[PDB]
Design an enzyme around this catalytic site. Structure first.
Site, PDB file in Angstrom:
ATOM      1  CB  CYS A 183      -0.975  -0.174   1.160  1.00  0.00           C
ATOM      2  SG  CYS A 183      -2.350   0.995   1.102  1.00  0.00           S
ATOM      3  CB  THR A 184       0.686   4.568   1.655  1.00  0.00           C
ATOM      4  OG1 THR A 184       0.301   4.038   2.928  1.00  0.00           O
ATOM      5  CG2 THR A 184      -0.504   5.052   0.860  1.00  0.00           C
TER       6      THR A 184
END
Lengths: 226, 226
Positions: A100-101
């Site tokens: 993800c991030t």
């Protein structure tokens, strides 16, 4: 013993970490580390309390490093101690991975320059300023770099790592032992499949976070330009 | 505020809990509890350290109770304090749920008598002696009881709970925010799809555990017969 490390930071999205942790900890001859500035409690974005097991200074050389995402990514993108640790470990690691991030942290560390990569759909525009070639695919490999999207990306790519570190039969055995065969009851896990009304709600809820991360990303990019 | 509780016990399979925790903690107007005999550290089967947030005595009346599985299920099947707590909460809960071998704990508590249920494939033979109607399906509902198989069953059924507690659009929004769209790189998550050689390896590795749990299950069944 294969040395696997996860960065554990305040306001982490804990499932990004805890999913691959449980899969990889199932493998023989693997030691898994939860790394922060010192051992002790670290609070996830949900309020779940986790414990870091080792400091940056005491962490062994890792074969696999994994950077989870979460709210807390913004602070980590301007943490010189964390970024220096990630660069040191990435130099010799067999695999450098993110969920993800977490790929925005690899970007801030300079490890996406000229590399194909992905990140969470709402933040995807921040990859290009960090020197990446943005790719809209759930798992993107470029040499020893794996970046994945989805809170459970690390479960899926942990099975790929198991097959490459050991063999396919070992990965298949772990999958069967965990009876891992997901079947989501909705099909809204991508902005391309979710209803337009849902995509709008999700974009509006991310807007303040995206605005703040545009500012952080530009400062991180300026440091890479130096 | 909807009150959601997970039982957190020594030698839990942490992903059984941490998956649904992160999904349900994303919802508005939800308070999530990690329940054990007292607040404080509880060690998962991998060595991951989690923290219980409330005692049995202090836990509010729950709308949702969730029992994870793991190695530690055997002890819990003969823990009279834990079983009494589960029965008390199940009496008034809107949903009584379990992941993997957590359904064996519901069985020991007497909550599967005459009910359709599933559990982990290697332990499925233990459901009938606990009074259940065994079903070989990944998610089995019988009234307010949901039992699921797979280390991530709780992620999938958490989206079903979100849709029923709130609405479909809310569940779809959470799925999109988490970019949840799994795609396992192998198809060995069921004994019906895995290679026969892999099924043999997994069965042989579970044999000592199954033997011990046959003994525990018969003592638990004797208590239900009284």
């Amino acid at each position: 013993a294969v040395q696997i490390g996860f960065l554990l930071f305040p306001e982490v999205q804990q499932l990004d970490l805890t999913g691959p942790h449980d899969v990889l900890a199932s493998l023989p001859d693997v030691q898994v580390h939860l790394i922060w500035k010192e051992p002790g409690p670290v609070v996830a974005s949900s309020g779940l309390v986790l414990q870091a097991t080792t400091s940056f200074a005491d962490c062994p050389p890792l074969d696999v490093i994994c950077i989870p995402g979460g709210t807390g990514v913004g602070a980590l993108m301007e943490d010189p101690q964390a970024l220096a640790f990630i660069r040191q470990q990435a130099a010799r690691a067999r695999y450098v991975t993110s969920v993800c991030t977490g790929s925005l942290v690899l970007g801030a560390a300079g490890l996406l320059q000229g590399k194909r990569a992905t990140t969470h759909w709402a933040y995807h525009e921040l990859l290009a300023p960090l020197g990446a070639i943005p790719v809209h695919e759930r798992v993107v490999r470029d040499g020893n770099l794996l970046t994945g999207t989805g809170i459970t990306a690390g479960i899926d790519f942990a099975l790929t790592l198991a097959a490459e570190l050991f063999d396919a039969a070992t990965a298949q055995r772990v999958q069967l032992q965990l009876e891992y065969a997901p079947a989501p009851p909705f099909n809204a896990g991508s902005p391309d499949t979710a209803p337009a009304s849902v995509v709008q709600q999700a974009r509006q809820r991310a807007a303040d976070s995206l605005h703040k991360r545009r500012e952080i990303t530009l400062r991180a990019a300026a440091r890479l330009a130096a």
